[model samples]
Target: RFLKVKNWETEVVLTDTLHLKSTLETGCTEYICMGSIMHPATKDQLFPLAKEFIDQYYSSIKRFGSKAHMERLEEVNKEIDTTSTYQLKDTELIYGAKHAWRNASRCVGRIQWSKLQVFDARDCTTAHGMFNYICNHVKYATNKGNLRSAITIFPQRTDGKHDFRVWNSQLIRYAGYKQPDGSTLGDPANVQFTEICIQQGWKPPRGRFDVLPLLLQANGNDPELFQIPPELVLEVPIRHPKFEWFKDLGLKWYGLPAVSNMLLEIGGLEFSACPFSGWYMGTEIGVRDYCDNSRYNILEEVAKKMNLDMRKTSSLWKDQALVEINIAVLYSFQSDKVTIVDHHSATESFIKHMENEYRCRGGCPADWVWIVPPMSGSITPVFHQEMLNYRLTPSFEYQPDPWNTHVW
Candidate 1:
């Protein structure tokens, strides 16, 4: 029977951190751990080999089992990196897996929702607007059963306050304004709204409340808005023995000797055997006297156990050759360097540190520095003369607010 062992205990933890209790409750027959290679050429080479391996193995499984009883296991592979960009590779892999699962499950059958619960809270104004638009449009299309049906426009109620209290509070908290009174008068005239623009990728209209309503009314249900292109899928390949290792590992299966053997086989290679595994050097050694035997280094013992040559590999010595070891040993050394330079310059030091005093204290170190240089250069005289004239005449100059004086 498929449920041969009703209750089983194992030590392995799944990638999602699912424990034994949850796994048993969900009837999780199998677990899969997906990983991808980062190198430019890995996708082109490893994918085909992995696919061929899977095809052969599946054929063997089919041959042994009754044709009717044979159930195809869930399988997916996706390209994580192409063109050598490493930053977004993991994000792409995660998204690809989610999309693949969605597509594959749909192809099998419409999923039963009795055991699942999907909720859309629409926590923010923008999200709420989008949710309403999508929900209404999807319902209309599904009922009509017309893929090309035009999305019907629905008028949104803009009279009520759009609960921006949480968002405003968040902004105030980030701007160093703790426990700000909701009724405190804010200067609309001199107020500089910069951070919101940067975060939103553009300058929002002068009055957000006035503009948002107009925007929603004009473009809420344009037919062009509903035409979202299908997401792209990048298929990746899985290596054979390592793939088997992943499956066994899911069942709380331990093969320490096998793991050690696999490590030894692929130890010195540049490419990962599977996308998940990689190699790194070890450098610490400790010794203990057991019974009457001569004391031996722990690293030396591990090297012997793993059958690795200690001479070729560098040791954790305080020397120039041991950069990797030094990096590991002296990791805490770089922590102090992180705060070495403050975002605000020395010229703007007073403005950043003494916020209340900045408005009253007008003269800045930068202004003095510009007016006078050490050697009395030609430009210094011109700046000094202009400064003196400015002090006497007090001509208004439009100085834009500093970038950092906003809710980050």
Candidate 2:
């Protein structure tokens, strides 16, 4: 939101109103409104915008419904009809969080969506409280590497006061430092946020895999820095199934992927600090983390060690190494008793999920680019199926980085 007008020369304000006029000035002759749920090109505002969440809750029920689900719908609609504020109880909040995972189109682990454990930290008013809850979440979800799906929600936006915020992308991301040789040491995705943490009085470990401190801001307060216990943060040491040389790489990954920067929307109220996580699908680590050019970039090294013809594309050297890398990841995690799913098995699970959703709900929405595994994209059944994707309420939505709002 702007101070008065779009891109106006004034101080920025974090408010309820959002405008699309500036972004929609082109490619349209006129604006279109889908009733109160969506406004023309201007702003949807509160209640009309709130319709999105209401519609989403209905869809969530269709995905998975019960007597308590019916009661929740009744209460939500009653608050709407009376112009009274809507609030989700502990049961409803927990159910809505599970449904949010079920309704996430990009996630590949929806088969376990209904099993998500919800942590209510909405009453927490200080950085110390957030630290305690996050550490607890990390520990409980890790479960000594037999990871369990979990989410921790904080206070949402209201008429006044402030929203809770976490500046880091994930609670356990690796620290990245730009080297003098124009390269990075850890995960490049978190470099900027790590610097922000260091500048804010965090004593970062001088290593590639250093666990960064937590940056939590509550109710417009100064962002607080908290250290996560070293022993409590579980990490898995990676070793190859066949190649002893691969074990020498000294690679490791955090046990969980607890994303901490996304907003959770339930009945139109936006929670800016709700972090949630599911267990890893092997390719996310095996392929993306290790093979991405901007990340670890280990494909060529593996291929070279395998004695493949580097000059010939027909050899598919990279592909050859990729398969073994993934197999090694799956093998290692299983060897350590950590929870992980392979792409082929995960694809089978995805097919079963669609059948269940099709039987219960009218249609299921999926994002193909994200659903398809990084390796063997065409072979998976999910890759061939056509999916319908659209906006839905009572969902978890990506929000702007906290530093943008200066809300910390």
Candidate 3:
């Protein structure tokens, strides 16, 4: 980036480094060699924004009845040097990540948000090391059959260096293969990413349920694909409690829905490679994954299997089949001793969570469409009550598709 500019213009170099009109202004030959933000900000502008953000965090924490966190953040900010990095020390990192989970609105299970198990891999500098951490994260979070809520944070970005980033949205996800016939063979949502994986020199299994290897990039290198050990992944076989024929449908989902391809922003700082998750709700699988036409689209087949009247519109076959499929999913997960919430229970818990939040923080923000499960739209308490959804800071966010590789 040190392309010589017209006279009096400054070209941003590495972190901690500065320039002048004719000569180096900071009297330094080069930046202090920090990590990321290849073009470190103008301190005058960055500091104020950072301070404002920190103040917002302080106020938010104080409102949550934690006056103790404010001074600590102030102290962390005061010690900020040329690094320009937020102080997310071990304990602070845990609290900050947990708070980010709680601060996010898309998550309905925020009551257990503070129970996040934080994996600190901030010191990792190699893609292989990041892979190791991911393996450990999956193994532990899967916990045999009982999944737990967790977040594994990779290196925090700074002028120091960008250490590692996971290229996939989740630590575990099935590959969606685009057949030559222009149809998908697995999860339709992942077809493009799967194509990228193979094009990038990773061989994927041809099966519909093949797990995609984790794609990781480090130190600005091309993304590397690493396979999760087959045993490390915990998937529940979907089977109905009474329908012996249901097991033949062959639908299953990984135990933990650990989304890795999201940017975890906190107090204006972005952790681009932070992966976090809780257990799944029945509808996430039953309605969206299994029933969505673009997905498995199993409703018609399930109805046929149930001997429903497909010829009669008045029969309400689709609705009947959908509820039955959800019932199967709930029953299967519970029978296997895996963590999952039924649509009714999930909404009930969400309503109570909102009530508690209303008493504590004035109001709770939620995406009504998401808060209400994909199945059984009207009966749930969340469906009856209105929600005011709004943007909140220190949250999880969906980033652009990784294929459109543009460096910021």
Candidate 4:
């Protein structure tokens, strides 16, 4: 039954002579031959040793009956249990003896190996639940203390300027009543006749005239007009008045002694950006880290180059604004040697066209080049208009023609 379940007929084995010849040619050592079958010092050594042990042990079991095989298996298990002791003895004999022998030989150039300091910060956020969750699970699992890494800051609520109106509008336009795939209208029950009138580029219907104006009017301050300089955003004061409350809670729940010990062990420090949101803080830090410069300065320069209005509010509120600029720069400055997949696709053709356009316009970097296909997507006219309204540029030149059958 076991053989049938495991598909035993597919298995094959080499003769002992062939196995020995292959192992020698492959520069491999069997644990049974080396008499170090129990050692588990490293995965590299342990797996091969285990395979050899199993091969030989199973062969013995096949030759002997179950009762006699059980005795041999018990003895083998005992040997494996003392693997650490065996490994230490083996290492001392091999390396220590070799070092002693090498002392008599002529000395060569000195080899200097420096110890690395691993920095790991845990519970660095102002949120108690999030900080504890990260410390207990993420830190322990990744052995963060043994590596240099940073914890993410928790997100805080934004002010009135960065309200959900723009997001809602954008979502409505992007994924509106009818999706790109021509899905059925979503929840038309509460939608007024005037809403449909506005969608069709007509004046509101008589009964629902009030609702249309309310929908069209900007609910909150226009975030696009006032660009918050990235530098200023970083230094923005924490909104939480009870910052000490989080600190006290963190110290008590996470064990003040353990936290102190970890800090001392890792020689780490805490950092956070204003707005306290994970996305905002992480994006800011990542941009700064990637550029190896002040994130605020990069953002400011990006805004200036893009001609984004910073006067209305911080430019950070515009979703994908920074990312688009950065990705464009990255694509522009990518190394020539980097291989791009799907180079012969229609996407690549359009990407090359865009690259040529950028080059002719003196916008491309000389040291970097992109070899990949351009990205493509479909959207409605309303969403396209919304992008123009917000000064958000999208790469949409290579759009698949719906009417042309040969184009695709």
Candidate 5:
């Protein structure tokens, strides 16, 4: 009886802008998994959680006390009583997965949570099969650059020791190389993982913007690397609408942002290898990716090229270049006909989504720091609003690196 609300009304229109609806999708950036510190519970501690979930699930369908609902609850309780764990019905998983996305406190794009495409891979038992499922997920979600939100859930963690995992933090990440002169090439964020791939026998192309291969772990065994087909990765070369010199800078980013290492939890069951994907907001690439000092760090380079005075912070050269970079990202994606949202459009819908969630669920959990855009904080509506960050079940939680936690 922990479930209080029944069936959220799906009538909230995300945006009045018709074009914006196409761009309304979640999983834009890395969400802070606050529940990662907590371990999954034992069977004795799971039945109540499972029953609560069943109540929530049945409640979601507007049949909380119906015969089917009561029967499902009884069956789940009975299964948990006999076996240590119980299986989730396909429909229950789909509903729970979407609910997890909706309940994601750090995601600003939850307005489109219900439209998620869930691919259940619970039956997959091998690293090779995991690779195949990942490739299929990528292909379907990429959809020729009209990126769709999707996730492929691998086998759940029955016992803590047998957890499945994906070693890579993101499914599509650029390789970083360390030079002999103490300089890092490509994305510095991935230097460690890139070295791991090379040690595992991957021949590095030694190029900027190279897509790294996926490393899959099944049944707590050694991870195997699988190269993603180049044709499947849709990259948009960053360019400015007016600046012809911008394209020559050789900047680009993948269309789909698929976070691979986070754990997906539903009804107290943990899926350790569930990778979720969706489209991107412009700032994720333009501001953070391009301007972050640890990554590409192209702000100064672009500022110099734009002939802005960099000697004095009073000149606001960084701010000027930041705006241009964001514009370039948005224009590049638009030119390529890829699905991307601008910060203005993205935050506007987020506010509308907040209103809808408040009306439906009374409150929504959000991290103000992550929810606000990296650039132009005051310009975005979310910057003005306060949000409370808290943990909720049926959530995505960060887990320890597989190589660190398990052998190989």
Candidate 6:
């Protein structure tokens, strides 16, 4: 039989040889974990991961195994030996950030991953400095509503004790206020963060769409609140193309969807504060954020306005409202000349991207749950295609809440 292995020692040697051969040919796999910094490592554990990252970078630029690549490896190894970590070249940083976007399993918009504008803010040393860089990221990415995908990388975590972190989950988000009648006045998802902001001396206006201030942390210090200038935030008023009454609802959303509060891991190093933004996929705002019971919860109101029979499940009133809502989101963004995508087209592009990835890398890392649009699961092509979920680095990974983890 092909599986017959009589001797344990012989089998162990065979397995080790195969592992070495694979590692040499393709480099080591980078494992991702939540709160990775909690698990500290020595030079012995870090060297291989760093080497794999350097190898991937060189390979990406078509310079793998060249003299410069060899030289870079040695330089990185020596730096790590002396300092316990090494700095990424600007080119490497840019490449790593873009690759992190590409490697993100939850993003359905990886087709534009390579086109990201990476802003290096690693020189930032203060919470004020973090605010400045974040404002710049918002301004650039918003781009007067023609939203551009961009990321600003703050300084890497030098040690487990001193980490830079963005306390807000997103760079731009509406404030949530707990009302007297056991209801949420604004975005319910932000209630806890808004309370934190209030405790930190932010005067809450108690408005449904008040933009929350930035809570930026530098060097493990308590986060400082910095208000984002109104001019920097581009908002699109949600209105249907045909249904003029939709405009009277007074619904609007920020153009840029910048996700902060995630760790960006490249090589053996981690950037604890990297805020990245991309243009919206219409359903993300329309279906989930607007209609989800836990979020804005706008479905019943819209259905009532449309005079749909909410009493009957067979009436399909919710579906009708959902379609109109998504249309309003797409139409509003398109009319305003802002960048946004309909779920259908977005899924089509993802299919193309998946095919390209398969051809180039022999496989694509995908999460079927995320790749399929939230509203329409079976209708999308990605819904039918089975996918393998795996971690690849450079990667954007979930880190713990800075407020929860920090020793105050």
The regions of model 6 sitting more than 4 angstroms off are: 1-40
Per-residue CA lDDT of model 4 for 1-408, tens digit only, reads 101111123232111111121121111245433222221133344334433433433453364436645554555445545542121122222222222112111111001001111222222332333323333432332231122212222221123221112111110111113335754232222233224335545453333112222121021222111111222111111111222222221110000001110001000111111110011112212233222332122344445545567676654523334454334323322222111112223233333332342343221111011111112112211111110000001000112111122111
Poorest 10 consecutive residues by lDDT, candidate 3: 15-24
lDDT of 3 by residue, 74-189 (tens): 66566555456555557557767887776565677877876889998877777898899989988888898778888888876564235357888788889998889987898898
At residue 197, give the lDDT of candidate 4.
Answer: 37
lDDT of 2 by residue, 1-408 (tens): 322211122222222122211121211234752322211211234455444454455554574356655565666666755654566678668867886787776777787878989999988898888899999999999998889889999887654347788877888888888888988988887789888988899887769789888898888678889888998888788888789888777888887888898888775667889988878899989999889988888889889888889898888998998998888888888889999999989977976786566556544555666787888987786776555443444577877777877743
RMSD of each: 32.4, 10.7, 13.7, 27.0, 7.2, 7.7
Off by over 4 Å in 2: 1-86, 159-161
TM-score per prediction, in order, is: 0.16, 0.81, 0.82, 0.18, 0.90, 0.89
> How many pairs in model 6 have backbone atoms within 3 A of each other, for residues 3 or more apart or on separate chains, i.e. clashes?
0
> For all candidates, what are the clash counts?
3, 0, 9, 13, 0, 0
List candidate 3 stretches off by more than 4 Å.
Answer: 1-45, 52-81, 159-163, 312-314, 406-408
Error of 2 at 286 (Å): 0.9
Superposed model 1: Cα runs more than 4 Å off: 1-45, 49-99, 102-198, 202-408
TM-score of 1: 0.16
In candidate 3, the residue pairs with backbone N, CA or C atoms under 3 Å apart (3 or more residues apart, or in different chains) clash, namely 34-159, 34-160, 35-159, 35-160, 35-161, 36-158, 36-159, 36-161, 169-260
Q: What's the true lDDT of residue 74 in model 3?
A: 61
- Candidate 6 has a TM-score of 0.89
Which stretches of candidate 5 lie above 4 Å from their native place?
1-40
lDDT of each: 0.21, 0.74, 0.72, 0.23, 0.85, 0.84
Candidate 5, residues 1-408, lDDT tens digits: the string is 111222123333321121121221233436645433334277788888888788889887899899998899889888888888889999999999998898787788999989999999999998999999999999999999888999999999987778888899999999999999999899999999999999999999999987999988988788999999999899998889998899889888999999999998888798999999999999999998889999899998899889899999999999999999999999999999999999899888987887787667755666676888998988787877756455566888878887777864
**Superior by TM-score: candidate 2 or candidate 3:** 3
Instruction: Please provide, for model 6 over 1-408, each residue's C-alpha lDDT reduced to its tens digit, 9 standing for 90 to 100.
Output: 111112222231111111121222121236643321322156887789899999989988898999999999999999999988889999999999998888886789999989999999999999999999998889888888778899999999877788999999999999999988999999999999999999999999999999999999998888899999889988988889888899999999988899998999888789999999998899999999999999999999999999999998899999999999999999999999999998889987987786677657655566666788988777776776655555678888778888778887
Total clashes in model 5, counting residue pairs 3 or more apart in sequence or in different chains: 0
Clashes of 1: 3
lDDT of 5 at 45: 85
